[PDB]
Amino acid sequence: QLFSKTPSVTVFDNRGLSVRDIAYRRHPDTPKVTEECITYHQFDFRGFLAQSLDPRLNHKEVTNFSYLTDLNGNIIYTQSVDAGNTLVLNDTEGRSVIAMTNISRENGKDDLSLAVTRTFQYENAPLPGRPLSVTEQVNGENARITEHFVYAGNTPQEKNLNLAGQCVSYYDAAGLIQTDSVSLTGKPLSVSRKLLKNLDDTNILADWQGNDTSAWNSLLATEIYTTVTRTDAAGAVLTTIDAVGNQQRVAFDIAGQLSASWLTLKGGQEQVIIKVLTYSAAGQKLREEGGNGVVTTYTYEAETQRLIGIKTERPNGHAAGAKVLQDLRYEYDPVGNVLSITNDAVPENAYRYDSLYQLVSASGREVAGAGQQGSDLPSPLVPLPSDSSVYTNYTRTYTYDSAGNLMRIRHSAPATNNNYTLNITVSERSNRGVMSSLTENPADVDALFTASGSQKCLQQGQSLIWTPRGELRTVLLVARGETADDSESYRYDGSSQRILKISSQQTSARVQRALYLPGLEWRTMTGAENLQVICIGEAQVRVLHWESGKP
Amino acid sequence: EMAITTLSLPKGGGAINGMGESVGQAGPDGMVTFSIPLPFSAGRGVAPALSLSYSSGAGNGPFGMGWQCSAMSISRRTQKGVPQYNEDDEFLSPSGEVMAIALNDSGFEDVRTANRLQGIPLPFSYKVTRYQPRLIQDFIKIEYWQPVKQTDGTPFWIIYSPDGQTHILGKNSHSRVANAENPSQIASWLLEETVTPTGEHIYYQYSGENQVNCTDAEIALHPQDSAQRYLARIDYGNISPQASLFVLDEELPNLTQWLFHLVFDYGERDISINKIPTFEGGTTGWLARPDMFSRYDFGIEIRNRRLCHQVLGFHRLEALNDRDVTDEIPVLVNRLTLDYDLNNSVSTLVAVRQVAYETDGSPITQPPLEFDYQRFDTGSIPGWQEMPQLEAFNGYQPYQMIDLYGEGTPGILYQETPGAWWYKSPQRQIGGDSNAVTYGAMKALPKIPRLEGATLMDINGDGRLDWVITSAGVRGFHSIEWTHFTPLNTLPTEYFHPKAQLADLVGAGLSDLVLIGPKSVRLYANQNVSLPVIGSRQLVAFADMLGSGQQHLVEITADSVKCWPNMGHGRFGQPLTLEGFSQPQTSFNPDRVFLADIDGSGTNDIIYAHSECLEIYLNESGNRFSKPISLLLPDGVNFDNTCQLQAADIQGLGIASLVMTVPHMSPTHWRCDLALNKPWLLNVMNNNRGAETCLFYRSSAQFWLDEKQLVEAAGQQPECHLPFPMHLHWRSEIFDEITGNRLTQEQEYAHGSWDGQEREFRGFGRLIQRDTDGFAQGTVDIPTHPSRTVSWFATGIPEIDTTLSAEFWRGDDQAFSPFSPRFTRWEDSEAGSDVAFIPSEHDAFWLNRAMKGQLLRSELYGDDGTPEAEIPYSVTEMRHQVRALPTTDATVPSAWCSTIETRSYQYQRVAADPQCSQQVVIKADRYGSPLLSVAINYPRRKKPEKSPYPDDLPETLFDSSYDTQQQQLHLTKQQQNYFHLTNDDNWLLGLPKEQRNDGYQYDQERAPANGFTLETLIASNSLIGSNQPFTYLGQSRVAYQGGVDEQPSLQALVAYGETAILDEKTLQAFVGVLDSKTRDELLFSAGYQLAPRLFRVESEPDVWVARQGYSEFGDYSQFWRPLSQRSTLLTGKTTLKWDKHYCVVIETQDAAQLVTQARYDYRFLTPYSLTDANDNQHYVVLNPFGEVIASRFWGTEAGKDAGYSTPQAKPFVVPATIEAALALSPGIPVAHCAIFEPESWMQKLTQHDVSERMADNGTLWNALLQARFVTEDGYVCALGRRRWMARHGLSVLMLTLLAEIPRTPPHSLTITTDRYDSDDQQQLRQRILFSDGFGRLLQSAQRVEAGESWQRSEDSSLVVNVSGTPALVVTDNRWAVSGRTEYDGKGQGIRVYQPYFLDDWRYLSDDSARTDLFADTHIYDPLGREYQVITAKGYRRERQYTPWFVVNQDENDTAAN
């Protein structure tokens, strides 16, 4: 009813180009008011995209995006109000050769004072021009070679391991990944990670100079983290032995779908994680029984294949008694927005959306009185509630602008009087926005970000440091000038995936380390707990194995 | 971009299609065409590209009525006079166009002397003359090669194709059709050899007609029989590379020097699939067809006795595998069998089928492609019915049913006073059947003159004396005027000035001429060997008794029928006897003999009238007569000399009906129509995979009556330009036997054009086509409405073409005025240009003719009853230019037609605000290549005061749909040049050279009110002129090697391609970021380089370009094959190593020394084995159709061997049936194996079952097999079944049996193994892919774990309880069915089903699916665009297309309300 005359419209020029995206925003509270939201796209003399403007900023004469291309429409230069200005270029082989980022402006011209220049180097002729190295250079600083690739040859030794033409050695920001063995099906059977020495010091950075692996291996810590895989004839992974020797095993059904999984801790016997798993005709999980005897049953809508039921239960005849642990029931609008959720064990979450399918109202329950939502988790309610009066109902309202920026979350918990409003202050010349506690002035929001658009302050006393690639480097939790700070740092692999997390708190010093490996989290706590977290599935089931400090 | 060669095993399997056969799109000629590409190998790449093709306008031949499978040829002109083998003879291009001796560039007759050709010295001297056709299509170069000394040898033809190919026609006697009495008198030169710049050859060997398997009577009747040729064998994949034609050598290469053969069998081999055809023919000799026929177009007899029964592919596998060639016999690869409905009148091609062979010799078959035709049926002859249209006549009043005006349908000619002749034109009867004919108001004949006993007269008029009038006379003692009217075309051309035998026949001249049928005329006289004497109890007449297309001489007595062949120019040949006709000498009366084509065979049949009976003797292909058909008169009628009877095509169908008037009998007027449709026309196709197309013809004459009715109702005057009936593609019904859905395509024709001056069919001026969906559901659940496309084509006649634009839709007052044809003269000294001119009347005839068949306009409508239904979705119109080209003929210019302008409007059924684009070819070179062209995008029209779009939209959308970018006039200029190699005796045109594009943008105010034309664009004040500012868009260049500099040689080897990336304007992307030096060294490092700007003006700066696509090639001895490839110079080369005869590449080595090796199955030249860069083996097994039916792989892992057992170690036999394959046990040494079942839609029938049901010990089985009701391997053929039923019926026992027998859509089974065969945990995954009769993916079934599913019955429906609810069962034979789709006739997914479980892999019926399974329905518009979706839940999504915006409404948007 709220959606009458709210279509999506695309408006064209005379050369088949989409120059306008038109939406129609209508709030259920004010169903007589319909906002026509228009996104503008301007194309140049060559038929390529030159400018894009959201409905909000267009009114204020600011351009969300500007592009400058080559004669074929490939973007070379970009101006973003959110991501700042950037410059990229590819070669004649289609390979990326340069990317300059974190550029702003002010004085009119582009500010390169903090520009990050990443360049890509490839094998030269007569080689097939495979990726050779990746160099990263921040303005005013020295260039670091952050990546290097080494490829195997044609020797019988290499062929027997199926390594010919494969990148056998990958030096990234964290250290080294070696590919030891490849399946007949072209899959890796053995990979080994070595860490760069002293990654605990945030000032030590990878820099693979030259073309000698001997000189590099000396920079690596001694430990070798080897993950071993065994795949089936169709190239699917059957067994996995992690770096500490635990095995995950899977089995597939006649249709090749995961049908069972097992775990064999090092020195232990094989045990069931997933006993049986059935699927719908559409290949969606239907019934899943685990090693704990617990059964999850998924209910789907026949017309739409939408998930309308999730039932986790201890079934009849279970050793610990039959009990429905969770029974989620979903009700959707014709388009597929979640209108309501129920759980059997009366509790109900109701949802209202605008004509753009933005969530404007949400009802639910919380342990009241919690207090105003922040970065913290609530204190855990221990033990498990027997009575539900321990919960109170809340209603939240959400307020968005023309560019989809969430400006307001109004929390209303009347009975316990736990009422508050989280305000987000949005810039008037970008989509940059921060909580009002940082600033309530739109004109000061952009300074709180980098030129790339990465936030520099999390909360009031908390600052954010970023890598040249725009990866989160350090969260400064409690600053103490000089020089003992509560902080948490991060490290990433060449694919920008997190490999290491180091938290530090003053008490000598509580240091919590997290090493992320295939199917494994290696977490140490000092100031000593040595925890190995086996991750099963892809992560669904987790196993906590202490080598030391089991509470 | 250049493709880099990568060795891979055939990675496919699943889908099932056919040979790529297709019905032709309906065109302005109205003919039904069909085409089947020959399913044989392309060899190295140079191969015969033959298609077996059908045309409803074609005659009989070596592939049956209407079919042909021939290569290019050059013949003498016959259509405007019979050739006499003198210098006045004319020659036709392979396109059928008349040629003239061409002029050279110096302005003289292009004649030369030659003693050398292609570097090969000729034994003697030749006079070489260049010929040029009146219409240029492909700029081919045609040379006539005549020995200077006539006795030195025979002449032949050379055709240089613009692709650099050279073709020689009729060099030796097998490739020449020549006079049986004088081999020098050549009628036709057939293609004999083709050579390409790569030194690859194709040789065409023909067999001459002979007396093998002919009866003695046939031999006696046709001694001159050696003329005709039949395609016998095609040799390709020549082992020796040679740039020059082999026919120029002293001797042709041995037969062993061709890797590939295509053999044509004419019956000498066993037709059985159980007998494998050998490369060697004989000694049984080719069979003689029952319907032998002669043609006499060339003034010589050509006898035709042979039919092609098999087409065969042969490879020299030993030679291709580089094994010992000694005593090699080429092996059969693919076999195409052809079934004919053999008939003494007309034999029809009724089936083509692929058959191939396993190593064990077992036949593996494809489903047959079947055809059937409209047939004359004596049992379905309509009886007599009264003819009320003659009610006004007393019953003694004489009349003649004749097409007086030339409308294709005869009207009523009579004498009213007497002395006064009046005519009633045929007209569409009102209210009656769609083809019912009445006759309009009388109209006075012009003053009839009457003199030399017979005089000419113009009636229509035309200015053409089209009518020969005679008068009966005179006996006895009776004073008396009653005349006879005879169409001039029923007489030999040389009737009034007879020479030879005609003069010997007529003498002083004939006394009288009396029509005895539509095109047969009885002769009445004054009072070598061996003409009849006109004036006994005999009949002498002119009639086509031979079906050859001429008015022959015929004598009929009580016991004889003799025919003398009209050989042209007054010459008549030796008499032919046609047995079969007899009447007692005591009752035989010549007056009671009528000559007409009754069965539409082409031959004139005999109709003899008795007092109570009419006997009809069908003419069997001019050889004899059938046993007579007895037509009883209506009860009470006794035919005598006071009664009136005539044979006339009163239906306008090209076949004679009978009009009888019997006084003293009421009613007095009677009709007998013997057929309602023209027989021998293809009307059904079925591929036995689920697709059937039914065809429907309608005469051009009926169409003319309808058109004339509409014209007369519109106050205008009807003018017919089509004087005879043509059978036009009227309707196609495309039927999906699996879903039961149909698509109807309907055609209407108007403005029919036949040219009297050149005696030539020009075609139709307007063609309207309706497309209507017809769903088996038979509800309105998919509410589609028919689409309508109105198209206008040029006829080449101004009197017709000038009236077409008036019919154009005029609902858009702002639309630009219609295009007009542009005529130019060519000025190539030395770049060339077209100069517009107004041709003389005489020149205008030919230059206008050049526009024959060109599409002028097209409008697309949706007939959905909406208010906007009369406004087209889109309109497209074209402007054509004819370049006049002078030859040695001073009176006929040669011509080249091209589409110089195209304009498209997108209205989307809103007349006021369309989009408009226009493409214009401004300059073309001497060979038709575009030099200067422009694409134009017009601005949007000015915003109106009110919205022309629905008020269902938001009220602001109209205003907000306007954007300034819609107001900018865009013109995109495109320049290009070419390399043309025409020096010496080579001919290679249109080689890519340079191209450049520039942009022009203007304000709406500068847009011309009447729009752009070519003249507007070459004008000095052009918007794209040299003065105007522009935006450089880029350029492209091709550089060649070896090669003068970077220019091409005949081999056209590309060195690299070079395209512009950056110029001074785009370089501004670097400004605030990098300085010039840094930018330049970056670009240089990234592989870019500076090159001159092409088509440079005013010192334009060089542009940064990218060069890609580098190849190194071998020499002539390696057939110029690529030896190395690389994308740019930034990387290393990949090396190619070819096999022995350079057919395929067997090894690649990239730039890191990685080596990939392949081994090929040489019956398909596809790889079957692959060794990868890590020395791993990959292996496939191919079935006899090149399909992968098993695959495995092995090699090493961690030193140890893995995983699948080698074929040597553990052979695997793929189960012969799916039932067996499903029942396989683990431990199979294959990763995949496949079973293909493309014939599963044909019901399976065994000899045993039929014989057990009929208890006839095999009788019915043997008969059904013989007629191909069923194939030898036991598949029931659809059309064979229908034909059989139509001729013999079928026992109810067989009906019962067949009802017990299930069908299943064409499908494939693919089994995929989980582990290597050494692993006992191995599972066999099972996936079955379904295809429909159109090659579309029907559904996919995957074997899943046991569980709950619906239950499929044997009848393919769902098992439901009594109430109708589907049963739910638990089974271990459960399948997950995904992607189930119900298509319409256009291949669009009308129903996409949710996945479902079933207790069988077999196809669940569409009835049960539509009733019980959830699906989203998709509704498409006439443009094939989805505009509505009804979800299973019942919600709707809609999409509205307007020229300037698309509106999208989802489930929420439409739910209200």
Ligand SMILES: [K+]
């Ligand atoms: K909406």
Ligand SMILES: [K+]
């Ligand atoms: K290997």
Ligand SMILES: [K+]
């Ligand atoms: K006939």
